[PDB]
Amino acid sequence: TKYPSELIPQMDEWKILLGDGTHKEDLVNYAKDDFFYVEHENETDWVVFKTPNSGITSRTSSNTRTELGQKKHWIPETGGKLNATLKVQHVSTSGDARVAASYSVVVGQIHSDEGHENEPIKIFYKKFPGHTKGSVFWNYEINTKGDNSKRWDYSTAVWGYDMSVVGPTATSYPEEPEDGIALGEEFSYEINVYEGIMYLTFSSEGHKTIKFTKNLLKSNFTKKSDIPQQIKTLYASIGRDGIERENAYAGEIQYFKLGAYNQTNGKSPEDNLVWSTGADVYDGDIAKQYANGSYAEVWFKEATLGSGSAPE
Amino acid sequence: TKYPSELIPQMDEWKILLGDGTHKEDLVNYAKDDFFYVEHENETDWVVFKTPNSGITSRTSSNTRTELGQKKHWIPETGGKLNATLKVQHVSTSGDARVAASYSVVVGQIHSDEGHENEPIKIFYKKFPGHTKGSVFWNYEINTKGDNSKRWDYSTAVWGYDMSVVGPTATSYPEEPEDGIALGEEFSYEINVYEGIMYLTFSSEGHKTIKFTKNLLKSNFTKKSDIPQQIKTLYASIGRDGIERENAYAGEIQYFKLGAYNQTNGKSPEDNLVWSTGADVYDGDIAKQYANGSYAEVWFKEATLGSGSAPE
Ligand code: NA
């Protein structure tokens, strides 16, 4: 009988989009069965975000989400911090293993509200079908100088693989990552942007805590000879060779998002081998996708917003 | 009670500078006698800011302040809202009455953290010696295009006079304003910056609620022919003919301040008849100033920070 707002005291600082295209700005005492609701398990309550592979998407995306967006925006220079503790309960059980996005779900992001509307960070959990352990990795998308159709993401592994580890054919998978994270296994992230520098921390009991620093005010990617080999390789059949503006996301307004942003869709892999995953979507029927594994589902027990801080 | 943080639940969102030059970042359970403390009166507790006319000033100013500064900064596009209810209990009883800033105290501001470090708004209370009623007015400072030494403030009256109404000699005063606010009389302000537009609301029991709208993204002062007449009298002595850059404070990082920023100092009126007030400051001896009326003291009942909101 609980609402998610009973578990997240800053619920009034978020709006939501659900997998069925519902937008809701006032989330105090709000739930909707099968998308955004509370689940009780032994001694903890969790906020569930559940979304199919193909529901009603936002105008900005081909992928379906049930995900919060922070109402108060900020530029990297003034900063912001998001802390989450969560477990992924389910990712799509179908999709083409040659496509980097298949079988994954983004569980936190910074999204830009203007300009190209790209993401300085998207944190993913990806698990191939049949595997016990999945991978957590995070992607930085360039704030492309000029035409955004040449953009790309650079993916960095936390536990397990990064997004570039694909199967060599549509239904054969790499071996499971030995150091990865199971469904139902708790982990935490913090995204702390202080004075334009994004400091990430990822922790999970029994695994190494892993930290990263990425300056969001000065690009590392301002010419062709700076594009990482990972981009040349993973985007080789797409054609993406953009460069990033010199000052990256300096002064660009953005905001946090958190929940289940499903990156497995039913688009044809031939149209985009990195992001169109060709999964089973049952012609958009949400109840049939839910009955056959064609969805993602992520549970959070803590989601806190605060100000950016100097790492100690 | 004793700590101002028992009255202001958001005390951890502010830092302070006191009139003796003390800076303190963590204000929970913090008070300093004679500067920042709580006074109980009839059935309400108030947070008191008290400052001499000449204490230890910030590097940025010739005036002394005991004043909060908001820790988390913002640009006008993303916005912010400050609400306060207060009463002014004392302004300096000495000063050259010809000088526009004399006998006044700023009780709320937006202050820029970069660039020229100018203020999109400072809210003043000013009361000539011996008057019962003082005036509340607010100043917008241009974000000067080019050299800031040509900057100026434009003052708009709320109740009573604006800053430009001065006495005819150093020691005599204009008539009391018909509509002003007495020492000890409560009034409220709200500075609500939503999508770059500043909406002000001022209210006090038994006076008209007054509202203003000022766009902080698009200057009304881009040509010399737009400089208001007011500036031509006040600033005649001083060389201030600047114009403002076209997009005003767009993208410039700001934050709110609230407290007692005393505008009466001991500087020579013959050097600057707008800001150099020639008051008695007893060689910077704070005790002697407090004993002889050379100070400002403002009590707040409420002080809340929030997001900017669309008016309605
Ligand atoms: Na901001």
Side-chain angles (χ1 to χ4, degrees):
Chain A
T1 85
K2 323 190 166 190
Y3 286 98
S5 47
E6 295 177 53
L7 303 179
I8 299 177
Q10 292 172 320
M11 181 107 281
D12 62 354
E13 290 186 35
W14 301 103
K15 61 188 73 162
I16 200 165
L17 165 59
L18 308 181
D20 72 355
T22 300
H23 287 263
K24 183 80 174 95
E25 183 84 21
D26 181 15
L27 296 178
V28 172
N29 299 327
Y30 177 77
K32 173 126 89 142
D33 288 350
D34 290 350
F35 296 103
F36 175 56
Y37 51 93
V38 172
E39 194 151 322
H40 185 69
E41 194 192 47
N42 326 305
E43 294 81 47
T44 310
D45 290 314
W46 296 86
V47 176
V48 176
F49 293 82
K50 183 184 187 171
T51 178
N53 283 358
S54 170
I56 290 89
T57 66
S58 64
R59 187 55 76 6
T60 51
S61 190
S62 288
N63 280 322
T64 297
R65 71 192 77 210
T66 293
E67 188 182 38
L68 304 185
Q70 174 183 33
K71 286 181 179 180
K72 197 166 196 286
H73 298 170
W74 42 277
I75 61 169
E77 289 92 330
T78 57
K81 183 188 294 180
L82 169 67
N83 279 277
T85 294
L86 62 147
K87 55 193 189 179
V88 176
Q89 294 289 54
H90 197 273
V91 290
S92 180
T93 52
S94 55
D96 180 323
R98 289 176 300 153
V99 179
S102 290
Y103 318 121
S104 68
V105 58
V106 166
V107 297
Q109 344 176 191
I110 293 172
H111 177 76
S112 159
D113 189 49
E114 49 191 356
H116 289 325
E117 304 177 46
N118 287 353
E119 288 98 23
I121 177 169
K122 283 189 293 301
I123 298 172
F124 286 75
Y125 169 93
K126 175 174 170 180
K127 185 191 75 60
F128 292 96
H131 288 181
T132 293
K133 291 186 265 222
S135 296
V136 173
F137 47 91
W138 67 273
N139 279 19
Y140 172 79
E141 175 171 40
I142 51 160
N143 196 185
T144 315
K145 185 193 158 70
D147 171 18
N148 204 212
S149 60
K150 290 147 172 281
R151 65 188 177 293
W152 36 263
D153 279 29
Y154 178 51
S155 187
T156 291
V158 181
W159 296 296
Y161 296 139
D162 63 43
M163 200 189 188
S164 67
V165 184
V166 298
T169 64
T171 58
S172 64
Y173 309 132
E175 71 181 25
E176 83 177 348
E178 153 72 34
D179 57 327
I181 301 298
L183 300 178
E185 184 169 8
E186 291 194 35
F187 59 98
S188 293
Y189 62 78
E190 179 179 284
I191 302 172
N192 173 25
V193 177
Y194 182 68
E195 295 189 342
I197 301 178
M198 175 165 68
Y199 297 98
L200 308 178
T201 305
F202 292 93
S203 64
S204 181
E205 166 67 25
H207 303 274
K208 296 299 180 153
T209 288
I210 310 296
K211 286 187 189 182
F212 298 88
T213 299
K214 174 67 181 174
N215 189 325
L216 304 184
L217 307 185
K218 284 158 156 209
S219 174
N220 287 329
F221 302 125
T222 61
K223 33 237 215 339
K224 294 266 172 48
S225 51
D226 294 315
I227 304 182
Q229 199 68 20
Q230 178 187 285
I231 300 323
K232 308 265 234 157
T233 292
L234 188 51
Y235 287 83
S237 293
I238 286 344
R240 298 286 185 84
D241 69 324
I243 59 157
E244 180 168 44
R245 317 137 131 61
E246 169 179 5
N247 297 134
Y249 282 92
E252 206 166 83
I253 291 160
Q254 53 219 32
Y255 55 93
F256 290 116
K257 304 196 77 198
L258 176 148
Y261 174 20
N262 197 348
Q263 304 294 111
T264 298
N265 52 67
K267 299 178 89 196
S268 297
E270 298 65 36
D271 294 348
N272 185 311
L273 205 69
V274 176
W275 297 101
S276 295
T277 49
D280 287 341
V281 296
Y282 299 90
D283 192 29
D285 182 305
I286 304 183
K288 284 188 195 130
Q289 286 177 84
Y290 281 3
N292 287 94
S294 282
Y295 65 97
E297 179 176 333
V298 181
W299 290 16
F300 284 77
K301 65 170 205 206
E302 158 159 37
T304 299
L305 299 163
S307 76
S309 61
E312 58 290 74
Chain B
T1 294
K2 103 105 106 161
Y3 295 121
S5 54
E6 296 175 59
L7 279 25
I8 312 293
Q10 291 177 325
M11 196 67 87
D12 65 337
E13 292 180 41
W14 300 104
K15 62 191 84 163
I16 201 172
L17 170 54
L18 306 189
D20 65 3
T22 298
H23 285 270
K24 177 76 180 177
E25 282 275 326
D26 179 13
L27 296 180
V28 177
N29 306 322
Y30 179 70
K32 187 171 189 169
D33 290 344
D34 291 341
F35 301 97
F36 177 61
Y37 52 99
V38 166
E39 191 144 329
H40 179 67
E41 168 200 66
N42 72 228
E43 213 236 9
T44 130
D45 285 332
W46 296 87
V47 178
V48 180
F49 293 87
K50 187 179 177 173
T51 186
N53 282 0
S54 176
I56 299 300
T57 60
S58 63
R59 285 158 94 160
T60 47
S61 183
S62 293
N63 282 149
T64 298
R65 75 194 75 207
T66 289
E67 186 179 48
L68 306 181
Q70 174 178 31
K71 292 176 176 177
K72 189 164 197 290
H73 302 164
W74 41 279
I75 60 167
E77 286 92 333
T78 59
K81 180 186 296 177
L82 169 64
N83 281 89
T85 292
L86 58 146
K87 53 188 179 181
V88 177
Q89 293 286 55
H90 198 276
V91 294
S92 178
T93 57
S94 60
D96 183 321
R98 300 175 294 150
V99 176
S102 292
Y103 321 123
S104 70
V105 58
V106 163
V107 300
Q109 322 180 212
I110 290 172
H111 177 258
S112 175
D113 196 43
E114 64 184 353
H116 288 154
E117 303 169 62
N118 287 355
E119 290 98 16
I121 173 166
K122 288 191 286 312
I123 291 173
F124 290 72
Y125 174 86
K126 172 174 170 186
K127 187 188 74 65
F128 293 93
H131 288 189
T132 289
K133 287 180 204 157
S135 298
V136 169
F137 51 87
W138 66 273
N139 287 13
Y140 173 76
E141 183 173 28
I142 55 160
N143 200 4
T144 315
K145 192 194 183 186
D147 201 300
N148 202 213
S149 68
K150 297 171 180 231
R151 62 193 178 283
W152 35 263
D153 276 35
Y154 169 61
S155 185
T156 290
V158 177
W159 300 292
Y161 296 132
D162 53 62
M163 199 190 190
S164 79
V165 172
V166 291
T169 76
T171 51
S172 54
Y173 311 122
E175 299 264 61
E176 243 177 82
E178 117 80 50
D179 52 322
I181 297 303
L183 293 177
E185 179 164 15
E186 302 179 22
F187 63 99
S188 289
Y189 61 74
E190 179 179 279
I191 302 175
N192 176 24
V193 176
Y194 175 65
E195 307 194 330
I197 302 177
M198 178 169 67
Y199 301 102
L200 301 187
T201 300
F202 292 90
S203 69
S204 182
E205 185 73 50
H207 299 276
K208 303 294 293 185
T209 290
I210 308 300
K211 288 180 184 184
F212 298 87
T213 295
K214 173 67 187 172
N215 192 325
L216 299 187
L217 311 182
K218 290 196 205 219
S219 180
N220 296 319
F221 303 131
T222 59
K223 295 181 306 301
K224 311 260 264 318
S225 66
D226 291 318
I227 303 166
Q229 281 191 151
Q230 179 185 95
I231 271 62
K232 315 298 174 52
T233 294
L234 253 204
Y235 291 95
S237 32
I238 307 167
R240 307 298 183 72
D241 66 334
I243 50 180
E244 182 165 40
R245 13 103 109 34
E246 145 186 65
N247 305 311
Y249 285 96
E252 190 161 291
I253 292 173
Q254 308 303 315
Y255 54 92
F256 286 120
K257 299 202 84 200
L258 167 153
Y261 172 21
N262 196 345
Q263 304 296 115
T264 299
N265 52 66
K267 296 174 74 193
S268 179
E270 320 297 324
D271 290 339
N272 184 321
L273 214 77
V274 180
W275 297 110
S276 286
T277 56
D280 291 337
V281 296
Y282 298 87
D283 195 24
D285 181 316
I286 287 168
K288 285 275 318 187
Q289 288 175 78
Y290 281 3
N292 286 96
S294 283
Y295 64 92
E297 178 178 331
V298 182
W299 285 18
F300 280 81
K301 196 200 302 217
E302 160 170 345
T304 299
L305 292 161
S307 38
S309 64
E312 207 36 347

